[PDB]
Design a protein around this motif. Structure first.
Motif, PDB file in Angstrom:
ATOM      1  N   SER A 215      -3.756   6.526  33.657  1.00  0.00           N
ATOM      2  CA  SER A 215      -2.617   6.350  32.763  1.00  0.00           C
ATOM      3  C   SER A 215      -1.649   7.520  32.874  1.00  0.00           C
ATOM      4  O   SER A 215      -2.059   8.680  32.883  1.00  0.00           O
ATOM      5  CB  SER A 215      -3.084   6.203  31.316  1.00  0.00           C
ATOM      6  N   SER A 216      -0.362   7.205  32.951  1.00  0.00           N
ATOM      7  CA  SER A 216       0.670   8.226  33.059  1.00  0.00           C
ATOM      8  C   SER A 216       0.621   9.168  31.863  1.00  0.00           C
ATOM      9  O   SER A 216       1.223  10.240  31.878  1.00  0.00           O
ATOM     10  CB  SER A 216       2.050   7.579  33.165  1.00  0.00           C
ATOM     11  N   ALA A 217      -0.102   8.756  30.827  1.00  0.00           N
ATOM     12  CA  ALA A 217      -0.239   9.560  29.621  1.00  0.00           C
ATOM     13  C   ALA A 217      -1.288  10.651  29.800  1.00  0.00           C
ATOM     14  O   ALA A 217      -1.148  11.749  29.258  1.00  0.00           O
ATOM     15  CB  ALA A 217      -0.585   8.677  28.433  1.00  0.00           C
ATOM     16  N   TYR A 218      -2.340  10.347  30.558  1.00  0.00           N
ATOM     17  CA  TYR A 218      -3.396  11.319  30.824  1.00  0.00           C
ATOM     18  C   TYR A 218      -2.808  12.637  31.311  1.00  0.00           C
ATOM     19  O   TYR A 218      -1.863  12.655  32.098  1.00  0.00           O
ATOM     20  CB  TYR A 218      -4.383  10.784  31.865  1.00  0.00           C
ATOM     21  N   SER A 219      -3.374  13.741  30.837  1.00  0.00           N
ATOM     22  CA  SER A 219      -2.932  15.062  31.258  1.00  0.00           C
ATOM     23  C   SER A 219      -3.770  15.551  32.432  1.00  0.00           C
ATOM     24  O   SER A 219      -4.922  15.153  32.589  1.00  0.00           O
ATOM     25  CB  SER A 219      -3.031  16.052  30.097  1.00  0.00           C
ATOM     26  N   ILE A 220      -3.185  16.406  33.261  1.00  0.00           N
ATOM     27  CA  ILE A 220      -3.934  17.018  34.347  1.00  0.00           C
ATOM     28  C   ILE A 220      -4.962  17.975  33.756  1.00  0.00           C
ATOM     29  O   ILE A 220      -5.996  18.251  34.363  1.00  0.00           O
ATOM     30  CB  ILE A 220      -3.013  17.748  35.339  1.00  0.00           C
ATOM     31  N   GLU A 221      -4.673  18.464  32.554  1.00  0.00           N
ATOM     32  CA  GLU A 221      -5.599  19.327  31.835  1.00  0.00           C
ATOM     33  C   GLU A 221      -6.866  18.536  31.539  1.00  0.00           C
ATOM     34  O   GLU A 221      -7.968  19.084  31.533  1.00  0.00           O
ATOM     35  CB  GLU A 221      -4.963  19.809  30.527  1.00  0.00           C
ATOM     36  N   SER A 222      -6.699  17.238  31.308  1.00  0.00           N
ATOM     37  CA  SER A 222      -7.817  16.372  30.948  1.00  0.00           C
ATOM     38  C   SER A 222      -8.588  15.849  32.162  1.00  0.00           C
ATOM     39  O   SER A 222      -9.820  15.848  32.167  1.00  0.00           O
ATOM     40  CB  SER A 222      -7.337  15.206  30.078  1.00  0.00           C
TER      41      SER A 222
END
Length: 156
Positions: free
Chosen positions: A111-118
């Motif tokens: 998902s474009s919402a997911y963070s790279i941090e995550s």
């Protein structure tokens, strides 16, 4: 692209101010100053893998799982291409060459919402959940972008 570039800069700026990155859980290194090529090493991995890293620092090299994020394949529309650079691992959902058999890294779980941090943490988790272990025998040449691509290829 200006959007992909800005989005990427936002992420790295987030990672920099995250307690995850402050606590020494990992690091982010723009290989060749490239904003599209990240070397994310997991520094703080209570698990069997956590064990293999202790005797990793001493015997051979340092103590971290080195990931490579490639953001050229239509991110954030498509997932970042993530692979394990080193060390060689067994299990942890790691495929031949260093590719990761992970949900969110697919065109059906990303998902474009997911963070790279995550996604970094989900990798740190997926590796542990899959009881990953360090193959102290094989040389790093076992893991190559070449071997990761064709591997991930068949996966799809």
């Amino acid at each position: 692209s200006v959007q992909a570039t800005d989005r990427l800069m936002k992420e790295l700026r987030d990672i920099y101010r995250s307690q995850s990155f402050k606590g020494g859980n990992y690091a982010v290194e723009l290989v060749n100053d490239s904003l599209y090529d990240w070397n994310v090493k997991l520094l703080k991995v209570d698990s069997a893998l956590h064990n293999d890293l202790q005797i990793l620092k001493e015997k051979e090299g340092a103590d971290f799982i080195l990931l490579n994020f490639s953001f050229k394949d239509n991110f954030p529309f498509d997932p970042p291409f993530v692979r394990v650079v080193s060390p060689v691992l067994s299990g942890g959902y790691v495929l031949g060459g260093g590719a990761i058999c992970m949900e969110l890294l697919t065109k059906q779980g990303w998902s474009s919402a997911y963070s790279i941090e995550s996604v970094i943490m989900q990798i740190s988790a997926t590796l542990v959940k899959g009881k990953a272990r360090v193959q102290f025998g094989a040389n790093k040449s076992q893991y190559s972008l070449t071997r990761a691509q064709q591997s991930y290829k068949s996966l799809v």
